[model samples]
Target: GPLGSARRLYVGNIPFGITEEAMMDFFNAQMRLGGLTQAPGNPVLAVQINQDKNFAFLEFRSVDETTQAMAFDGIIFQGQSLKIRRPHDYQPLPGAHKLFIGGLPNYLNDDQVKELLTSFGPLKAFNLVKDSATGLSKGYAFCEYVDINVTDQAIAGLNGMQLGDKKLLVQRAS
Candidate 1:
């Protein structure tokens, strides 16, 4: 009964008017175009559309088929070029981490901020808020840790530590 992991491809900026049938048909042709031999059934197992998000998740029959489908990235579908990537393979953003740290001093650069946070634990990603127009610190940041316990430790230890003149507010982002 073990089916292993589901191979799902994320296609963003999909044309809103396209239907599931049309999507599958397009992928069917694309798979063939990519020099893959067709399975007896459709390579596309299912399609879940989020029209408002302008994206769709396509479930392929197997990992092999999905790998074949990846060749279709940047291929045009209904006028706009398709943005294809494996949703399961996506990494967290540099700006998005496990913790939201607010009330930072405006003078701290990314290196200074990273140094202070790294004292808590190793970081997966670290980003400081900067004013877009001025390129100066906005006094906030997000940091991610690979370990939850380390993240908890960081939160407990750094939550009220005085950085410059302000007490840091460290909390889990979501």
Candidate 2:
């Protein structure tokens, strides 16, 4: 156990157009982390490319492996140098980590939305999107939870489930 022994890392400066093949090949063929998990859209096993061509985030399963990958910092891959470090303080994607309660009957307010999701788990924060001019509900809102475990649970249990009359699209923010 050391300063970085328990910390996961985020890898960046990856090549543009970084596909699953590119990510797994780097981890398996070069770094040899392990065989890539086969689960489709497995965030844990893939590199997420940002809109910009300059970076991507690779989430290693464990801190140990992340530390090992950090050792490859400044190493070259596909003609690009690597940048490795611990993730910085970051916010979850707007309305993604949160529950979007739409199709409401236009009478509900922020307090009502918060009360409904509280039954699911402890709510880190809640927001009812408001019109800039009237300051009234925008009909769609975001309910963000604090814990990833809670987020996952909510997504599993609430996705497509009827809130009142409409099916909801509950999911992880990012």
Candidate 3:
């Protein structure tokens, strides 16, 4: 992996009106909870936003900063749980792995559902799909387990299971 492998990340589904400091504040809180001890003054190096596109780029002081940041992908800020990830230009994953999980409670954030899916296996790439315009969860997500064998296990095990008031619809992404 090169320098920007995780150092610079792409953030999507931001609201049209959130300020720069608060955006980083929400993410800064995530790191604080994760207990970042070696922070270089501030873990966030800089932020760049395209308000018209409703997306932004976050630069961390180190790759480790951004690596832990990945776990919060689809986390709520002011309005929406953000769509955070490596920018498409710097892709390095196989990009051939995945699952589509749906019928989630809107209250759930990244790690809450993360705890659920981790039962079958750990996820290397995950995204809880959102309505970019409304900044709301579609109660569905896409993820890829670190090991492919667990895909079937998850679909067989979690599908139709109850969570809140809805049943999980776990299946392979088509």
Candidate 4:
């Protein structure tokens, strides 16, 4: 589930004494080396800790970047491995814009389809073309996104992307 693809991560195991500043400080270093922060993008925004609960919440600039940060699942934080999970209250946009892609294997399921699209942003809808009668895949899908940049990025990145021996073609629905 990749913990629902969140930008806000529920970070537990806070050692009970670390300051909010140190939490932010720790994440900045991780993001720097992890290359989660881009050449011209903001990194983590802030850190808030619940001292009584011994847990903390931290934020990253984007869902994609945070997903990368989540890769540090077992990262050592002050001698204790941190517990990084998606914050329970945090949910995707109550989902925007339309987009399209094809050349994915018909064998791939909706679970994988979502994992693929959400790397850019949350989906408003991803209508994968399937056999109207047989209820099977057709290897192509139409999706909707809110991120204005995603449309451009998906194509430039996925164009000629080999998925199960077939290159994808991502384009505007219109």
Give all candidates' CA lDDT scores. 0.78, 0.61, 0.78, 0.75
Residue range 66-103, candidate 4, lDDT tens digits: 76777878799889999888766444542223567878
Error of 1 at 122 (Å): 27
Q: State TM-scores per candidate.
A: 0.48, 0.41, 0.48, 0.48
Note the residue pairs that clash in candidate 4.
none
Residue ranges of candidate 1 with Cα displaced over 4 Å: 1-6, 89-174
How many residue pairs in model 1 have overlapping backbones? 0
Q: Please, what are the lDDT tens digits per residue for candidate 3 over residues 1-174? A: 234544888899998787778777777777888786365356886788889989989888876677778888888777677898886645354443467888899878778888999987777788887789987787888887766667788888999999978888887776
Predict model 2's lDDT versus the native.
Answer: 0.61
| Model 4 spans with C-alpha error above 4 angstroms | 1-5, 40-42, 90-174
> What tens-digit string does per-residue lDDT give for candidate 2 at 90-114?
3323344545656553567888877
Clashes per candidate (backbone, < 3 Å): 0, 2, 1, 0
Q: Candidate 3 — worst ten consecutive residues by lDDT sum?
A: 88-97
- Highest TM-score: give the candidate number: 4
